[PDB]
Amino acid sequence: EENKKPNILFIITDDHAYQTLGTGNNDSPVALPNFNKLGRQGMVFDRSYCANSLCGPSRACILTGRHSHMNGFVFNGQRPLDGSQPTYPKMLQKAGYQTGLFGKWHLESDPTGFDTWEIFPGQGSYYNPDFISLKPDGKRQTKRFPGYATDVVTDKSIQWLGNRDKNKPFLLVVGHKAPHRAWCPALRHLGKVDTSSMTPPANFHDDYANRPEFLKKNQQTVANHMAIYSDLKVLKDQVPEEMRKSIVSPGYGWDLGELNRMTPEEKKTWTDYYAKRTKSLVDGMKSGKLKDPKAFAEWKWHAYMEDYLGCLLSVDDSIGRLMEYLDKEGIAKDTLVIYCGDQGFYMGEHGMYDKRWIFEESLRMPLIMRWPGKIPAGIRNNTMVQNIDYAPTIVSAAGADTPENMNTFQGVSLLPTAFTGKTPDNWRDAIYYCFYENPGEHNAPRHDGIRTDRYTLSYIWTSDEWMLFDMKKDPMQMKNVIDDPAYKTTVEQLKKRYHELRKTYKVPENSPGGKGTPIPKFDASW
Numbered sequence: 138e139e140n141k142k143p144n145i146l147f148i149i150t151d152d153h154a155y156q157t158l159g160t161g162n163n164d165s166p167v168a169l170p171n172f173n174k175l176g177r178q179g180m181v182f183d184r185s186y187c188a189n190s191l192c193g194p195s196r197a198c199i200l201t202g203r204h205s206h207m208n209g210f211v212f213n214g215q216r217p218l219d220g221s222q223p224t225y226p227k228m229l230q231k232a233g234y235q236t237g238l239f240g241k242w243h244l245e246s247d248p249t250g251f252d253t254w255e256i257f258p259g260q261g262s263y264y265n266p267d268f269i270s271l272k273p274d275g276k277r278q279t280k281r282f283p284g285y286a287t288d289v290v291t292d293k294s295i296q297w298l299g300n301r302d303k304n305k306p307f308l309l310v311v312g313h314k315a316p317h318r319a320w321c322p323a324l325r326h327l328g329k330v331d332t333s334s335m336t337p338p339a340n341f342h343d344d345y346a347n348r349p350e351f352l353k354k355n356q357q358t359v360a361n362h363m364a365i366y367s368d369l370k371v372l373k374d375q376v377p378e379e380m381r382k383s384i385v386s387p388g389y390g391w392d393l394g395e396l397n398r399m400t401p402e403e404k405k406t407w408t409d410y411y412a413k414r415t416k417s418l419v420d421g422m423k424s425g426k427l428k429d430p431k432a433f434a435e436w437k438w439h440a441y442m443e444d445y446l447g448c449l450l451s452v453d454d455s456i457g458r459l460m461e462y463l464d465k466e467g468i469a470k471d472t473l474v475i476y477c478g479d480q481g482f483y484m485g486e487h488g489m490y491d492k493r494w495i496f497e498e499s500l501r502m503p504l505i506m507r508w509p510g511k512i513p514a515g516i517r518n519n520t521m522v523q524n525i526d527y528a529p530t531i532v533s534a535a536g537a538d539t540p541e542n543m544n545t546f547q548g549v550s551l552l553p554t555a556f557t558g559k560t561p562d563n564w565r566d567a568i569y570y571c572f573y574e575n576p577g578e579h580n581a582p583r584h585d586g587i588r589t590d591r592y593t594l595s596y597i598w599t600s601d602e603w604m605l606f607d608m609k610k611d612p613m614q615m616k617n618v619i620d621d622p623a624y625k626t627t628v629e630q631l632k633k634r635y636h637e638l639r640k641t642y643k644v645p646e647n648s649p650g651g652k653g654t655p656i657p658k659f660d661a662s663w
């Protein structure tokens with residue numbers, strides 16, 4: 138009588154832009170053959186979004202199937218996630234799954250619902266990573282594992298799979314650091330990415346005309362908010378001392394902390410390679426070419442892109458090893474593979490890096506699923522889905538969709554659209570988005586809004602400014618049409634829909650709050 142329950146392998150990277158996902162001809166600035174093969178075997182979701190574009194909050198939305206103001210983790214703050222609330226791992230654990238988590242957590246409380254967990258302290262490190270775990274007595278320990286984080290998380294994950302109770306279906310969360318700042322590739326990949334043929338986005342030199350005034354205060358531009366030695370790997374002791382002031386943005390001269398973690402042999406391979414980029418900077422300053430701020434900005438983009446894409450090469454290696462394991466173990470047909478990035482990222486669009494904004498690059502999050510025989514292979518899905526939907530999807534796939542469990546979710550199961558590749562009748566017409574971390578690193582504003590099929594509508598609470606983009610006519614989001622008479626009735630209807638969604642999702646009046654309010658705190662609710 139019992140029906141087989143599928144294993145669930147959830148691979149989650151950090152800050153992976155959909156523009157670099159590697160699934161087809163137009164998102165492969167570098168070739169990622171294992172990403173491409175996963176897509177060929179499954180479904181890529183091209184209208185996949187987050188509800189709060191920030192690392193911690195996205196992971197909490199994924200765990201709970203609920204918006205940030207409901208799960209309580211609204212910013213990368215020091216208020217811990219309340220792990221006693223409902224979460225999908227606990228629901229699967231209860232339903233007979235063996236559950237494991239390796240890598241990034243950053244939710245400030247011990248993981249709950251995981252039989253096994255070994256997590257980075259915080260952000261994690263690319264080189265020689267530390268991991269925190271409990272001993273049998275319940276007490277915390279921290280151990281360093283030599284190697285490169287993307288490889289080490291994969292090693293521990295495959296080792297755990299081999300030692301699992303094979304009579305229980307597994308849930309395995311593989312939480313990669315990559316491609317998070319400061320984008321340090323594995324030594325074997327240094328020099329494997331040549332960006333000389335690449336061109337920055339058409340709006341790389343965005344002056345922010347026709348956008349809310351607050352955008353001009355953003356502190357996530359490639360041109361002015363990158364650390365020349367840490368983000369872009371320049372070797373200070375190979376820069377003439379007289380030239381150091383001209384290459385550092387004020388306050389952005391910190392050291393690359395990864396170098397202190399490396400062995401001398403590792404550091405030498407690294408600095409041997411980065412001497413080339415450093416000489417490029419020095420020669421470009423001496424020639425006067427990089428004294429043109431726009432030219433220096435493009436030079437910084439090529440360094441950022443090289444390192445960022447270089448990090449993806451080892452994520453592709455990880456996907457390959459994990460999928461090879463499932464293949465050889467004979468369990469690929471009974472495993473639902475989910476790949477996502479916590480959120481998307483700007484690859485120079487609007488002159489920016491990072492995320493946070495409701496703008497499409499960071500509202501999007503890459504999402505691929507594979508479940509052979511259930512999810513059609515090689516399909517691109519244009520259905521609007523969101524990270525609050527992953528928990529009900531997983532719980533439904535696991536057969537743990539009790540009324541008690543499902544009643545805790547604000548998202549909806551994606552299985553109807555993952556099984557068809559099409560948009561179901563009466564599918565949700567809009568999603569809600571809210572971002573809270575102001576004041577905060579990068580100075581993105583507290584802002585919320587909705588995304589429909591065609592429009593993005595947002596109120597910026599910090600600056601008291603409304604914005605509307607018509608994605609049919611302006612997909613690059615360069616023209617705020619909130620005050621254009623052509624959109625007067627559209628604005629009226631969308632504002633109505635925005636207040637309806639705030640009411641449906643139980644958003645408090647005065648959240649997320651303007652400059653006159655503290656960043657809000659919430660008790661978990663469901």
Ligand SMILES: [Ca+2]
Nearest residue numbers: 151152192479
């Ligand atoms: Ca992130």
